[PDB]
Amino acid sequence: GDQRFGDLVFRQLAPNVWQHTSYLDMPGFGAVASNGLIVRDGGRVLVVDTAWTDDQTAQILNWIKQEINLPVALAVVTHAHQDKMGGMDALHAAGIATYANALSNQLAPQEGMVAAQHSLTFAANGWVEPATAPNFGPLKVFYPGPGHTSDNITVGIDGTDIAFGGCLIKDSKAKSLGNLGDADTEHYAASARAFGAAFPKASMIVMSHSAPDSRAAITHTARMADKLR
Numbered sequence: 001g002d003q004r005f006g007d008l009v010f011r012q013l014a015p016n017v018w019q020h021t022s023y024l025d026m027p028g029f030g031a032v033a034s035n036g037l038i039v040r041d042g043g044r045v046l047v048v049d050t051a052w053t054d055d056q057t058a059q060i061l062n063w064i065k066q067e068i069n070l071p072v073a074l075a076v077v078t079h080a081h082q083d084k085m086g087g088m089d090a091l092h093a094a095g096i097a098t099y100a101n102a103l104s105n106q107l108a109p110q111e112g113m114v115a116a117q118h119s120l121t122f123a124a125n126g127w128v129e130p131a132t133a134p135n136f137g138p139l140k141v142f143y144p145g146p147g148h149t150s151d152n153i154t155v156g157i158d159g160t161d162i163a164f165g166g167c168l169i170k171d172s173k174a175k176s177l178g179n180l181g182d183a184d185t186e187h188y189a190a191s192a193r194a195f196g197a198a199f200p201k202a203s204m205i206v207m208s209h210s211a212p213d214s215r216a217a218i219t220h221t222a223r224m225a226d227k228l229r
């Protein structure tokens with residue numbers, strides 16, 4: 001199922017959905033995989049998250065050209081850390097319109113990231129303000145509250161059983177919540193559960209650092225986060 005393409009890995013999840021995976025050495029710790037998504041919506045392609053680097057992100061675009069061969073209409077990135085925004089310049093060089101949580105764009109410079117071109121804003125209940133996410137097709141963007149970071153956002157794919165938790169969600173057998181350096185430990189559990197409640201039909205949960213899992217990823221992540229309080 002997995003397709004090795006250079007130093008990246010691509011896995012089809014649904015007729016119109018693929019997971020992209022890229023790797024970065026975290027010195028002394030290891031080569032960390034990070035996942036995002038590629039969605040075909042009719043005659044265009046939508047991307048969720050960059051790879052870690054510009055070069056890797058250009059390779060995602062090369063894979064899209066070879067395997068889908070339709071324009072990439074936009075990309076949305078799910079918080080201001082390198083695994084999700086490190087390739088912003090490659091998207092801009094390719095002429096792709098880019099979107100992030102307003103807070104992600106504000107944080108980008110201090111995090112060493114390049115901001116996206118457009119800012120998403122969110123209603124009090126967490127759903128994106130639709131005028132800020134034009135032409136998102138089946139992508140349904142939800143801010144679940146602070147968790148892995150204060151700016152973390154999540155994405156459901158309408159018409160599929162897939163929802164993407166990014167770095168908020170860990171798999172159903174994960175031993176830890178990963179990098180909590182920028183986390184909101186008090187609100188993490190509620191934010192994880194809010195993600196699950198926003199996408200009740202999603203039976204396939206996609207996340208940054210593990211293979212797609214069942215909804216037990218959500219319950220297990222929230223149960224682990226209960227202990228942080």
Ligand SMILES: O=c1cc(CP(=O)(O)O)c2c(F)cc(F)cc2o1
Nearest residue numbers: 026032081082083084167179181208
């Ligand atoms: O494996 C990692 C992955 C990340 C990126 P993320 O948190 O978005 O997964 C990371 C980071 F951003 C800061 C850090 F200090 C250690 C880290 O270690």
Ligand SMILES: [Zn+2]
Nearest residue numbers: 079081148167
């Ligand atoms: Zn992160």
Ligand SMILES: [Zn+2]
Nearest residue numbers: 083167208209
């Ligand atoms: Zn992460």
